[PDB]
Structures are given as C-alpha cells and as structure tokens.
Structure 1
Amino acid sequence: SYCGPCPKNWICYKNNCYQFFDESKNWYESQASCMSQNASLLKVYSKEDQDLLKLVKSYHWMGLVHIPTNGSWQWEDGSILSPNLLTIIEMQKGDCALYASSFKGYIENCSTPNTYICMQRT
C-alpha cells in the first residue's frame, strides 16, 4: 500500500506529509510559504506518530505562536499546545518558536530568518 496523497516529493509518514525548506525566512513568510502549498507550519501533536522528529538536526520554524494577553502558546489552527509534548526553552525574547530535537521549542523573535518545516495531514 501507499502513503499519501501528499505534495510531490514530500516526506510521507503515518498519515502526515512533511517538507523541510532550507531557505531562511522569518516566521510569517514561512507561514505564507506553507499556506501557498495548501499546508501549514509543523504542528507537534504526537511523539509517537511524529517520532521521526527526534532525529532532525538544526532549528526550524513550527506553527507555534505566543499570544501575549492570555500568556499561552497555540498552533495555527488555534489549538493549545498539549502538555508533555514539547520542552519550551527561553532563548530570545519573542512570540514564535523554533523546533529542535528532541521535541524542544526554542522561543525566538518572529522576525528572525530560519529554515522551516511544512506539514499537511492526510
């Protein structure tokens, strides 16, 4: 049997599609990039289904954002960051988060160019 459907040449794994874009962009152009391909920035929801994230080098924008007013981290789809998924680490004053293995989120200035990971379910 097959994995997908996914965008062409994307990683496919447990009903999820992934692509690692090595072009450095700030969080917002990264978001725009994933959108333009009918996808979103990486959403971490399961250590098991997304266990491949354990062996990813370097740092990459994911879809986690801090809304200062409620003091909470949430994904692009509005869902709250589920507990015991990511270790959030203060690094730079900012409202966005870089994914780093193993299942870490480094707080970073949304304006800082970084590589990024797009994700598309099903």
Structure 2
Amino acid sequence: MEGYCGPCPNNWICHRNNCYQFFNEEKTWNQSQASCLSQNSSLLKIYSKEEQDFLKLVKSYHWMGLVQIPANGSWQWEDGSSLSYNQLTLVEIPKGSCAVYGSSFKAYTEDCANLNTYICMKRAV
C-alpha cells in the first residue's frame, strides 16, 4: 500500500511491512516463543542487516528465534533456515542452546530457561 506499512497487529512497530513488537515481560525462551505464536508471529529473525538496519540500535537483550543443535554445535532459526554469518555475529558462551539479540547484529548464547524480554516479528508477505 502506497506510503503505508502493514498490515500489522495494533500498536506494533512496522518497517517494510515487517511487524515488530518489543515485549517487556520477562519469560523463558519457550514461553516467549508461545507468546509470539499466540499473536500469529514468531520470535525475531534477522534475515537481512540491510533491510532491518534500525535493529542495530536496539539495546538490552531479548530472546530471538535462534536455536542450537548441540550434537554438532550448529545454530538455526525456528523456521529451519540456517544461521548465516552475514545476518549476525553469534557470541558463544559454553552452556546454552538459545540466544538473545544484543544490538549491533550480535547475539549471545544463553540458557533457554533464563528469563528475558523478547521480540516478536511477522515477516512481510
């Protein structure tokens, strides 16, 4: 729609028809994923630094949709697509199979049971 961004849920942040919401409730990774799902979305995925540039400015730490396969240490998004080196820099801390977004397209591995704020996203269709 010319000059407009959406459709998005009410009060969500919109950029290039991607919808974001920054939730201040502290939840486990699993509870955060369930919250996003209940609102027809998923946890934050970084698909493009260029297209999601403003997210470089988001401070603090928030659950995002990045999960580990401990068997060989690889990481992928909830949707099954692989983590790409040009999407974000992952700072690995020996214990933890989930990751928080931490500004500047960096993520930090974190125990999935930890309580964090979280970011949901609906990708533009």
| TM-score of the aligned structures, taking structure 2 as reference length | 0.93
- Structure 1: where are the runs of 5+ without partners? none
- Using the aligned pairs only, state the percent identity: 72
Shift of the alpha carbon at 1:18?
A: 0.2
Q: Pick from 21, 26, 29 the counterpart of residue 28 of structure 2.
A: 26
Q: CA RMSD in A?
A: 1.0
Shift of the alpha carbon at 1:2?
A: 1.1
Question: What is the aligned length?
Answer: 122
- Structure 2: where are the runs of 5+ without partners? none
Structure 2 counterpart of 1:17? 19
| Matches of 2:97 and 2:26, distance apart in 1 | 18
| Matches of 2:96 and 2:67, distance apart in 1 | 9
| Matches of 1:90 and 1:71, distance apart in 2 | 10
| Matches of 1:82 and 1:90, distance apart in 2 | 15
Question: Measured at CA, do residues 59 and 34 of structure 1 come closer, stay the same or move farther in structure 2, by a change above 3 Å?
Answer: same
Structure 2 counterpart of 1:114? 116
| Matches of 2:56 and 2:94, distance apart in 1 | 23
Q: After the TM superposition, list the runs of 4 or more consecutive aligned residues in structure 1 that deviate by more than 2 angstroms.
A: none
Q: Pick from 67, 89, 106 the counterpart of residue 104 of structure 1.
A: 106
Residues 50-89 of structure 1: CA distance to partner in whole angstroms, max 9, x if unpaired? Answer: 0111111100000000011242101110000112221111
| Matches of 2:69 and 2:40, distance apart in 1 | 24
Query: Which residue identity lines up with residue 74 of structure 1 in the other structure?
Result: Q
The 8 Å contact of residues 92 and 109 in structure 1, kept in 2 or not, is answered as no
| Matches of 1:14 and 1:3, distance apart in 2 | 6
Shift of the alpha carbon at 1:92?
A: 5.9
